[PDB]
Design an enzyme around this catalytic site. Structure first.
Site: not given
Ligand SMILES: Nc1ncnc2c1ncn2[C@@H]1O[C@H](COP(=O)(O)OP(=O)(O)O)[C@@H](O)[C@H]1O
Ligand SMILES: [Mg+2]
Ligand SMILES: [Mg+2]
Length: 395
Positions: A99, A101-104, A239, A242
């Site tokens: 959560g 923002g890795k995938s994002y 990617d 967690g």
């Molecule tokens: N730099 C960012 N800016 C804006 N929103 C973000 C950002 N990083 C994460 N998010 C938001 O929170 C959501 C979860 O991010 P996500 O990539 O799934 O994290 P992770 O892959 O580490 O679990 C994303 O869909 C996005 O809406």
């Molecule tokens: Mg992810």
């Protein structure tokens, strides 16, 4: 060495929940500094970290998100793209809790595309811009997933959940036997392969699993023309799973990654590359022949303090790792040369067990990397149209 692993920390903006429930923001950015404030302002003192880059956003508005992705690509993407075109191996991996923002960052969304689509688009833009009849470009792609120390091919039309064996060769190193390396000639091929790959991820018990690692890889082969020379740049966009703690060997690769980073931060005899699939396959990306960048994504609110801190700390160590990247000139010729040589020597020693089918393996590798470009194109095509026919019986 030559170059240090460059480190960026990306702080995602406060989301709707954190604002509604009045979760306190403890992470803030001061240029290239990341300041982590205590949760209940005894050792409640602000902790300051310094990195090569730091990204942050004021809100979750579309403007700030567009600006964010643009910033991330301009800061990291074009550099490693340039590395690719300079014949360097390059790598970018995203580290942080679920959560954060890795995938994002790596993949992004439909309206907010991340590093990978921009990288592919820019790659084919530049290749199509530069390609003469003296200069030619060959682009290959692969996308694998590592879950529970098992490797799956995400580009296989049939998500058979079948594991691919990780094998080691003496002159080739660690490789995934059976992994698809598909020839692509435009952004849309990559796009369809990627959209199909991203919906083939490992499902959890409830929502894709946050325990799996995703490795995307681009191979760029540049040929300059009464003879011709060749350079090969290999991009690795990763990617990771967690980084948070558990809530057998499901976390083997992550922990081993931590240990590898820690060991390098302080001839790889006591660097535990082989203690996991991830660190073994990405051995060259950490303290090897590669231009490596780490993006440490963190959450801003207090409820994730101890995680954020941890992430930060790991990031703080990653910038002490020294790589030694060189321009890879005509690697295929050298590889097939060494392979055939080894084949002959194995043939000779065989006339006197573990060498019986080692030669079989070597010959297999030789035959598989002497495959003509045209047949690779045909392969990618039949794969594509089988994906086009797999939705025919499903409609
Ligand atoms: N730099 C960012 N800016 C804006 N929103 C973000 C950002 N990083 C994460 N998010 C938001 O929170 C959501 C979860 O991010 P996500 O990539 O799934 O994290 P992770 O892959 O580490 O679990 C994303 O869909 C996005 O809406
Ligand atoms: Mg992810
Ligand atoms: Mg590849």
């Amino acid at each position: 060495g030559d170059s240090k692993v460059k480190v960026a920390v990306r702080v995602r903006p406060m989301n709707r929940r954190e604002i509604d429930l009045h979760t306190k923001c403890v992470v803030d950015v001061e240029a290239n500094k990341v300041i982590l404030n205590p949760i209940n302002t005894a050792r409640g003192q602000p902790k300051i970290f310094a990195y090569d880059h730091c990204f942050w956003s004021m809100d979750e508005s579309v403007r700030e998100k567009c600006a964010g992705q643009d910033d991330v690509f301009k800061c990291l993407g074009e550099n490693i793209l340039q590395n690719a075109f300079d014949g360097y191996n390059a790598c970018i991996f995203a580290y942080g809790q679920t959560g954060s923002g890795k995938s994002y960052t790596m993949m992004g969304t439909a309206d907010q595309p991340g590093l990978i689509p921009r990288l592919c688009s820019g790659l084919f833009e530049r290749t199509q811009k530069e390609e003469n009849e003296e200069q030619s470009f060959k682009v290959e792609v692969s996308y694998m997933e590592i879950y529970n120390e098992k490797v799956r091919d995400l580009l296989d039309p049939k998500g058979s959940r079948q594991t691919l064996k990780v094998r080691e060769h003496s002159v080739l190193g660690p490789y995934v036997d059976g992994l698809s390396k598909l020839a692509v000639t435009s952004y849309k091929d990559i796009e369809s392969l990627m959209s199909e790959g991203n919906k083939s991820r490992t499902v959890a018990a409830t929502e894709e699993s946050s325990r799996s690692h995703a490795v995307f890889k681009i191979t760029l082969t540049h040929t300059l023309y009464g003879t011709s020379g060749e350079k090969v740049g290999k991009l690795s966009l990763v990617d990771l799973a967690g980084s948070e703690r558990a809530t057998s060997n499901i976390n083997k690769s992550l922990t081993t990654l931590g240990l590898v980073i820690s060991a390098l931060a302080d001839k790889n005899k006591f660097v535990p590359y082989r203690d996991s699939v991830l660190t073994w396959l990405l051995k060259d990306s950490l303290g090897g022949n590669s231009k490596t960048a780490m993006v440490a994504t963190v959450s801003p609110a207090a409820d994730n303090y101890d995680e954020t801190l941890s992430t930060l700390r790991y990031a703080d160590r990653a910038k002490h790792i020294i790589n030694h990247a060189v321009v890879n000139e005509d690697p295929n010729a050298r590889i097939i040369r060494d392979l055939r040589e080894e084949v002959e020597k194995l043939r000779e020693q065989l006339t006197k067990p573990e060498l019986k089918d080692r030669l079989e393996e070597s010959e297999k590798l030789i035959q598989e990397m002497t495959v003509t470009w045209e047949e690779k194109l045909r392969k990618t095509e039949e794969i594509a149209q089988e994906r086009q026919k797999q939705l025919e019986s499903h409609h």
